[PDB]
Design a binder for these strands. Structure first.
Ligand SMILES: Nc1ncnc2c1ncn2[C@@H]1O[C@H](COP(=O)(O)OP(=O)(O)O)[C@@H](O)[C@H]1O
Ligand SMILES: Nc1ncnc2c1ncn2[C@@H]1O[C@H](COP(=O)(O)OP(=O)(O)O)[C@@H](O)[C@H]1O
Ligand SMILES: [Mg+2]
Ligand SMILES: [Mg+2]
Lengths: 49, 621, 621, 49
DNA sequence: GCATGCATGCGCATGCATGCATAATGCATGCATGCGCATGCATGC
DNA sequence: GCATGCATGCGCATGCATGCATTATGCATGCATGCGCATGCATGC
């Protein structure tokens, strides 16, 4: 805890909590992509990303 | 914490604005009577139209839609103030009251697929179906303890979701005294509130074809615990918030989003008295005639459908015996006689109507099933189509294609109206009182006139006895009848909705006369409006008639006459056998006709109409 | 913290007991008028006799003495309740009121040397002297802040010694808003209370000889800030508690014990009117005669001592000029003439009396001194004997042994009544208005009759002019006078206190006649009781007489007559020179006599008495 | 902090404070003792305890 | 009616995000008091 | 009056009880889903 406190007693260890109602949020998505069948080498399993 | 706030312009002004909003003294507002109704009914929440608020105060509506929590707190404070004002005694029972929301939200009307982070911390509306529900669980709010060693009682207050973020100092259950004397919990004096969690999915009818569905999770508080069930179509209005994860050092930065419900909705006198008392017989006469203008002729089928809509009377006795009161009909006819149109109209008009074709649903999906819950290992019951349609209508198109086992299963519903279910570990008797419509094609594609109806129908006598009525429809190619049919069809085709420009792409008791939908000749008569028809049908269904002594002997003598005429009917064949169920059918149709005209007792005319229907349906040339 | 208490038999019963204790309706109690006096005087604490509580309710007194804090809390709650009951408006000003204690504590009456851990957490009484004091400092109780960015004001409450143990969560000063907007402290709206610390030592008179002293530390709260000063003898009643050390891991197990004060004490009409109005001259006649039965004869010295007790009148004018009003006397006599007995009696009777012999106190310890405080580096003033005795009496035995410089220092007090002090960094004028008694032996051991008094006294004319009166006492060995002296001395010796068995080891205006202390002949007269004498002396000292025109010319003419008779007095020598101070002395003695008999103006008889005194004292055969 | 807390969050490090009003106290004194002058060896400084 | 197909159904393994448990030592500061110094006061002769 | 004694007084060093400052990593648990198995239902011929 980064507060100047002289004479006062001090904060304990690991005193921080995340406030959810005071945060900025954005959309998030994950996709799975496969190699084109037109370009997959003969006799080889397709790769993913 | 000794920190307090002395002044806050925004909160005080918002509270004042809501105080002026809910006054209803110099205005035509109704909320005062709403509050009085709430006091009368011991309920503790209110529903307020959003459009009304926007009309009265647009800025407050904008702020409430954009910012939810603080404005909702101000609403609740104002409710507490006015409940104290009107009756301070009643406000003592409950800690704080709550606010519901209603009206057209407009842009915020959002599908489960289109909910995004842009709507966070705002009030949103969502339409969906319910898929998962959980058991009701109590939660502690105020705890009370007693110390036998020192004869002292203490109380602790809990507030977890009241504040946005909680700390380890709170939510601690006390067990020991200051001098380590044991404390005894006293559950009677504590305070608990119920809690439930449900899941909502986007309806398959609305989702894009071929794509996976998306769902939202909802928390139901103490009041709204029992308002939802799985497999139900609902609309939920509430806040959309983030979920605080428990304490840790390293965070990935992804929250969980949960919708906290505030409103849950299941989507759905003088005139009646005068009309009934004046018309009597003309009531059912016009109702049969004005059943569906889109369908030509077939007065008997319209009468039978009306009898289904009104129905019989359920009766119970001392010994626990049950007597059926529902009616059942089967229609068989040539193609293009508009059987499916009739089924669709009954689906639209009836309150609880479910369509289930022949092979669309199997025997398991019709009645019910038992499944072993993997989460707990217990056995649970899942209701089928017929159990959901309690005191309702099930429509079965292409009834002939249904398999034998499904019909044997339907026997239990058709005879007694109950379903018995059993698997080792659980057994139950579920209620399934229902009425059935069915349409089946003839076996030869087209009905053969020369052959007797038994060969054409191809159904056993037991199943035929299960049904109250059988009807046969034919497409006779009379030139004048064809002319009438063509006139009617093309009149309906050329019609256009009023108020719509030509060439564009895409309540009074009696309906206004129309030049095309009715015709010039029909000016001497009128048709009944749909809304009044539904209201009258509901009122008639409520009414409970009684059978008279005059008609009982008459009906019994006619039943004996029919069973003797069994030998007299030599020129014509019989569609259905005459069993003991025929007498109950007679009484049921008599009571349905007595329901049609609001009265107190069953008369002879209803018996005569029932007997005419029976004579027409049971024999054919 | 949401923890609350619902029932507590002991606390509720104790509060009820105090409620019944402070009712005073069916009893002769006075506390109601005490509360009304407190409301009138705007003070906010009460003092209650412990013996009274024990008489009314012994169990409550036992519990309060054995357990302090909880019982004191109950007292304060009961005071709040009754102050609200009598006048709820006044109770709004102050948060909580306080209780003082008084009466004979008995076993708990404890010296600073005999305070032990056995008396911890109890209420104790202690008698001591004050040695160290500290500056008054404010302490924050309620804090108020304002945010210019958001135009919102907040308030925080502090409670440190209200609770036994404090935690780091409290006692935190807020400086930033929830969104890091700076806050501006507003000192006007906050609440502060004063705080002081003092130290008390066991009095050297009570401590065992040759042993080091022991001391206690006391904390003075907001009300009792200015009630103590260094060098003062006080009695303190209060709680004796341990001091919580600040947070740490390893503790030695030794606490600090501090006494928290609750009470601090500085240890110390018709009859008068009738007696004065009836007696007039007989007032001072009897007062002079009944000054001290233990001392035989010497009427003039008794009159002079009475004049000191009554004193003159202090006067001030427009230009800021000051005129002295005190009297000063010097007695010179042979050994065993009871000068020291007179000094001791004046010490006992006078309210503010301090004895300071010749070489017992030096010039620095008489007036004052300046010391550099090592703690701060500043300069502080320490008052001497004469500054402490403001408007009081200083007795100086063996006045002849005093050094010259001390007498030059005493000049400033004797002339103007003020002390001027200066050292680089500080300078002050302290008030030292005072009266002096002095007794000095003759230079030759015994007073020589033939030599003039100037040779015997051996003092300069300036110092003699500083004194108002000079008296010479002799031990004449007349057989009848010796017989009278022996009679008086042996009568006093044989006397025994009534109520004490013989052989054992060790208010009416006029005193009851005694066979031995007074004698059979003195039955026709009586002596005045000491208590009434003190009351009358105080009342007379209050009264402010005025000089009349009749006596001013008379006194001036007699002063001129004396200054001319300076040539006429050929048969006798003069004890003291006649200067301008003699006229002021005449007026002062006249005003003192006018004080003796309660009146409004100075008359001729007082002037005549003053002149008789002057004539007797100023010349001798 | 020796309390069983499951589901509840836990106490920080070093959470204990001494309560002064709930302790038992006794008297305490220290003395200085010197060797007897009757038995101190000749020409030796006395010892203390 | 008997022979066959088969959509439903159940129990135990691993993989992966969140969540849970642990836990004295060294260095700094103010109070008490010795030791050298110069001023100044008081006391004799 | 001048020569001497001396109780008071002040500033900077050390010794000793209290008090102050510091501070991520490793291991455990429940949710999702594959793989082998036996029962049972439904569908032909
Ligand atoms: N009596 C009638 N009145 C109006 N339209 C009719 C009538 N009979 C048949 N039709 C028309 O013929 C079509 C029959 O279709 P459908 O109801 O599916 O026949 P079915 O149910 O016998 O297969 C309907 O579109 C309807 O418009
Ligand atoms: N006038 C008197 N009356 C009574 N007692 C006297 C008188 N004069 C002297 N004494 C006795 O003589 C003693 C004188 O002692 P003290 O007062 O010390 O004398 P001084 O003060 O003169 O030295 C006292 O104890 C007192 O009892
Ligand atoms: Mg059809
Ligand atoms: Mg004497």
């Amino acid at each position: 805890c980064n507060t100047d406190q002289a004479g006062r007693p001090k904060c304990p260890l690991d005193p921080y909590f995340i406030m959810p109602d005071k945060c900025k949020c954005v959309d998030f998505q994950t996709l799975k992509l496969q190699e084109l069948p037109d370009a997959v080498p003969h006799g080889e399993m397709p790769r993913h990303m | 914490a000794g920190t307090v706030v002395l002044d806050d312009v925004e909160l005080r002004e918002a509270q004042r604005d809501y105080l002026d909003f809910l006054d209803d003294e110099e205005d035509q507002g109704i909320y005062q009577s709403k509050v009085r109704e709430l006091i009368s009914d011991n309920q503790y929440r209110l529903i307020v139209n959003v459009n009304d608020l926007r009309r009265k105060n647009e800025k407050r509506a904008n702020r409430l839609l954009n910012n939810a929590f603080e404005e909702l707190v101000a609403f609740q404070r104002a409710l507490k103030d006015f409940v104290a004002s009107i009756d301070a005694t009643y406000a003592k029972q409950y800690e704080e009251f709550y606010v519901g929301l209603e009206g057209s939200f407009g842009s915020k009307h959002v599908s489960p697929r289109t909910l995004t982070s842009c709507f966070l911390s705002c009030v949103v509306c969502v339409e969906g179906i319910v898929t998962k529900c959980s058991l009701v669980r109590p939660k502690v709010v105020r705890s009370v303890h007693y110390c036998p060693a020192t004869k002292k009682t203490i109380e602790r207050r809990y507030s977890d979701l009241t504040t946005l973020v909680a700390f380890p100092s709170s939510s601690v259950y006390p067990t020991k005294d200051e001098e380590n004397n044991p404390l005894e919990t006293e559950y009677g004096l504590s305070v608990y509130k119920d809690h439930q969690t449900i899941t909502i999915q986007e309806m398959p009818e609305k989702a894009p074809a071929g794509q996976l569905p998306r769902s939202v999770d909802v928390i139901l508080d103490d009041d709204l615990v029992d308002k939802a069930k799985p497999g139900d179509r609902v609309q939920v209005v509430g806040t959309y918030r983030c979920l605080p994860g428990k304490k840790g050092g390293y965070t990935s930065g992804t929250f969980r989003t949960v919708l906290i419900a505030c409103n849950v909705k299941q989507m759905s006198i003088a005139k009646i008295k005068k009309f009934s008392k004046t018309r009597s017989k003309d009531i059912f006469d016009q109702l049969a005639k004005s059943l569906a203008p889109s369908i030509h002729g077939h007065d008997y089928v319209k009468k039978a459908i009306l009898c289904l809509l009104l129905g019989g009377v359920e009766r119970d006795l001392e010994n626990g015996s049950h007597i059926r009161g529902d009616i059942n009909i089967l229609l068989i006819g040539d193609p293009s006689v508009a059987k499916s149109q009739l089924l669709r109209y009954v689906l639209c008009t009836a309150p609880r109507a479910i369509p289930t074709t022949g092979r669309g649903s199997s025997g398991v999906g019709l009645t019910a099933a038992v499944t072993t819950d993997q989460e707990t290992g217990e056995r649970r019951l899942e209701a089928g189509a017929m159990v959901l349609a309690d005191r309702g209508v099930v429509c079965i198109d292409e009834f002939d294609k249904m398999s034998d086992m499904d019909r044997t299963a339907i026997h239990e519903v058709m005879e007694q109206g109950r379903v018995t279910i059993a698997k080792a570990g659980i057994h139950a008797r579920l209620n399934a009182r229902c009425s059935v419509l069915a349409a089946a094609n003839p076996v030869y594609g087209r009905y053969d006139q020369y052959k007797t109806p038994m060969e054409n129908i191809g159904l056993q006598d037991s199943l035929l006895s299960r049904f109250d009525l059988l009807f046969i429809m034919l497409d006779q190619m009379d030139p004048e009848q064809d002319r009438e049919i063509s006139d009617h069809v093309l009149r309906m085709h050329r019609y256009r909705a009023p108020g719509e420009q030509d060439g564009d792409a895409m309540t009074q008791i009696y309906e206004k006369h129309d030049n095309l939908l009715h015709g010039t000749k029909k000016k001497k008569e009128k048709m009944v409006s749909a809304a009044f028809m539904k209201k009258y049908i509901h009122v008639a269904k409520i009414i409970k008639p009684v059978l008279t002594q005059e008609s009982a002997t008459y009906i019994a003598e006619e039943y004996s006459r029919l069973r003797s005429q069994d030998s007299m009917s030599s020129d014509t064949a019989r569609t259905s056998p005459v069993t003991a169920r025929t007498l109950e059918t007679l009484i049921r149709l008599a009571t349905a006709h007595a329901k049609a005209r609001m009265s107190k007792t069953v008369d002879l005319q209803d018996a005569e109409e029932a007997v005419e229907l029976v004579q027409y349906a049971y024999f054919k040339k």
